[PDB]
Amino acid sequence: LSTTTKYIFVPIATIGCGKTTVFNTLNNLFPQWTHIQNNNISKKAKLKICDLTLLALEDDDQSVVLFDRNNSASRERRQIFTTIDQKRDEHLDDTVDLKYIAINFIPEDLSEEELWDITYNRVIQRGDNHQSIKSQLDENLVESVMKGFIQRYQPINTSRSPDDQFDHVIHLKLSKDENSLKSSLENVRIIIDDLVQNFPDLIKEKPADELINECFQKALDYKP
Numbered sequence: 001l002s003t004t005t006k007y008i009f010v011p012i013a014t015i016g017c018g019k020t021t022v023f024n025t026l027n028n029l030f031p032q033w034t035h036i037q038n039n040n041i042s043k044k045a046k047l048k049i050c051d052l053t054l055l056a057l058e059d060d061d062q063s064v065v066l067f068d069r070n071n072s073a074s075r076e077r078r079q080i081f082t083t084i085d086q087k088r089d090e091h092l093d094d095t096v097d098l099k100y101i102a103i104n105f106i107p108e109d110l111s112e113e114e115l116w117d118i119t120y121n122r123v124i125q126r127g128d129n130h131q132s133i134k135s136q137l138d139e140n141l142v143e144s145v146m147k148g149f150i151q152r153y154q155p156i157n158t159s160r161s162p163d164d165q166f167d168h169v170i171h172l173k174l175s176k177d178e179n180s181l182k183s184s185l186e187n188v189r190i191i192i193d194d195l196v197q198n199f200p201d202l203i204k205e206k207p208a209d210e211l212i213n214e215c216f217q218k219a220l221d222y223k224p
């Protein structure tokens with residue numbers, strides 16, 4: 001009504017880390033949030049993901065964008081900061097404060113071998129919606145595309161440009177599932193607990209654990 005803060009949640013990830021599952025679970029819990037899926041945008045689209053992000057922050061209704069793209073390379077993060085900063089004046093007045101929250105999907109201590117074993121097996125066993133591999137016809141192609149994102153992966157580094165522009169980093173886990181607890185569900189809980197602590201005015205009421213579980217079950221059983 002006088003000073004509003006908006007949030008862009010930015011993954012740092014590779015294919016199969018669970019971005020879509022985590023973000024769908026969060027959107028099930030918080031319907032007012034906007035999940036913008038790079039998978040669903042034509043590469044020949046007039047409005048690209050950065051444009052749709054700013055449009056989805058214009059109304060007083062709209063506070064949060066889940067920016068669903070890998071951003072494995074540092075240049076992909078730089079693109080977000082520079083484009084949103086250049087264009088936000090077309091959409092937002094000067095009373096709107098924008099915060100960028102990194103969602104780090106790949107732990108610093110994770111080897112490339114473990115990253116591959118977890119994510120590749122997820123994708124071949126359960127499928128993925130990344131535009132170029134959603135079909136699974138040439139399995140060799142799925143491998144080649146996934147290897148591209150890993151070859152380009154540059155870990156988050158908030159000590160220098162561009163990642164120093166993040167206002168906050170949420171560090172996720174990436175694990176084989178253990179004790180019947182899916183890694184992505186653990187990460188949904190990490191995000192929720194982290195926001196309650198660091199941005200209390202965002203989550204007005206923390207959801208019940210059974211609601212979190214149910215919203216995650218819904219995301220998990222979604223098979224397009």
Ligand SMILES: Nc1nc2c(ncn2[C@H]2C[C@H](O)[C@@H](COP(=O)(O)OP(=O)(O)O)O2)c(=O)[nH]1
Binds near residue numbers: 018022129177183184
């Ligand atoms: N076993 C297991 N599978 C998971 C978990 N999180 C997501 N998945 C499944 C759902 C998908 O079929 C596949 C890739 O997940 P995704 O959410 O589409 O990843 P992403 O490519 O959007 O980053 O892995 C998880 O925590 N455990």
